[PDB]
Design a binder for this molecule. Sequence first.
Ligand code: SAH
Ligand code: SAH
Lengths: 239, 239
Amino acid sequence: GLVPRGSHMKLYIIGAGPGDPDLITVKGLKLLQQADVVLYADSLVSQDLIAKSKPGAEVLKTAGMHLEEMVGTMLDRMREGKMVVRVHTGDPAMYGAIMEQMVLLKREGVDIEIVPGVTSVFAAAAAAEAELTIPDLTQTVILTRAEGRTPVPEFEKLTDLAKHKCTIALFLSSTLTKKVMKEFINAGWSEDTPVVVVYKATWPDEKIVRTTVKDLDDAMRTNGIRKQAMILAGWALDP
Amino acid sequence: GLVPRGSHMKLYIIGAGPGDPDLITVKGLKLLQQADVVLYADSLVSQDLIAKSKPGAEVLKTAGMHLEEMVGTMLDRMREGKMVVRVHTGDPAMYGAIMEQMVLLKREGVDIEIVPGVTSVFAAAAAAEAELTIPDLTQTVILTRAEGRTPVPEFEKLTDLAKHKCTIALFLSSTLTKKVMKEFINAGWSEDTPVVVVYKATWPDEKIVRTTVKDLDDAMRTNGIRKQAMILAGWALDP
Ligand SMILES: Nc1ncnc2c1ncn2[C@@H]1O[C@H](CSCC[C@H](N)C(=O)O)[C@@H](O)[C@H]1O
Ligand SMILES: Nc1ncnc2c1ncn2[C@@H]1O[C@H](CSCC[C@H](N)C(=O)O)[C@@H](O)[C@H]1O
């Protein structure tokens, strides 16, 4: 491009997708292939996607890094004229923890561009061959998380949310299935209501488990699923 | 590939994304480029995405086609040994109306593969630079539609859903903003609660409107948005 526009002062926040390297958007892949600096969280974002960055890119893992340092590193590379990008699992809007870095960067005059991606809810619906909305059955899909030690807001408890009897998709809840069950049975759900668990959707080790509220905790333990699972609950998951 | 596996007896149900041709997944684009037969719904799925199909592909519009005919055409092409694919807006799980064709096709022994895509909810969150989940504010995102003449299930009315005070994302509701407002104010929401409307997210004519419950219907009419809008309501949309 011919003329300087201060385009290094930008962060691209790219929705990698659920894990298969080909479920990134075409646009996210173009940016990932041009970036000079690639930030991401190990074993959640596939290594085969991150290896698509160009020879010479600086690839940084952010897990063991505090907020101000990560941000300070991003700005240093930006101010050296580098194209900097941060790759997030699924779509960043769902528990991507992007707001804190955005607020600090915009105060330093950085532009943000978020590139939307395939969220794991939808990757799991697809793998399960389910549409989450069924005319005359349910027209609402509730994205949430079960409460473990970190409480959820007062008006968002799983039981209250489950009184709507629609489709419920649980993030960050694979080791909270006893709590999920209790919450569903206290809302009045049948213990036979369908629950589909998709562990690592789209990865080579994906597992699809079909079960019900009553066997949820046993199907989790029996199948060894203790992380990275998307739980789809409702009559739209009836096979 | 060396040996016959009955691989023509398959339907790929591909999540095109919100509209920009580059927000299709890399995988959906590969399938779209190989397909012999491409089915889709005009002006909702961009022409520039559908033009990526290969020279010679048969491109069929399905709007003016009944269920059994579309299905009967899909099977005829399958049984001639053709690779057949159907391209749906956003992600097919959200009001993609895929279940009816799946049930009829599986009875004829067809395999289904759904390729998840970027739903318009997430395309609109990105355009608005918003994360929909904020620790200590909201951990739940409710995907639904306002009720016009086609009623929603009894336990899924907008007001009841809005008592959770979380993020609410309305599909198919751009000309129902008076009903949405009433439903939000009856649930007790402040009339100042942020509402972001993204009309045609990612298309060349995208418009981002920032407003509140109280000015929702006027901001829609004033901006001329009467279709293809994604309404994100909640304190997570506070700019
Ligand atoms: N490939 C995958 N399969 C199943 N669940 C997944 C997943 N990737 C992420 N998750 C879900 O996401 C949680 C992490 S929170 C990050 C979610 C991501 N923003 C997205 O849109 O998918 C996990 O606990 C699990 O609930
Ligand atoms: N590009 C876009 N911008 C805004 N809303 C859009 C959109 N594409 C589809 N929609 C939303 O989707 C509705 C059609 S129902 C089909 C939705 C699609 N399955 C998806 O996941 O996005 C529209 O009324 C509008 O609410």
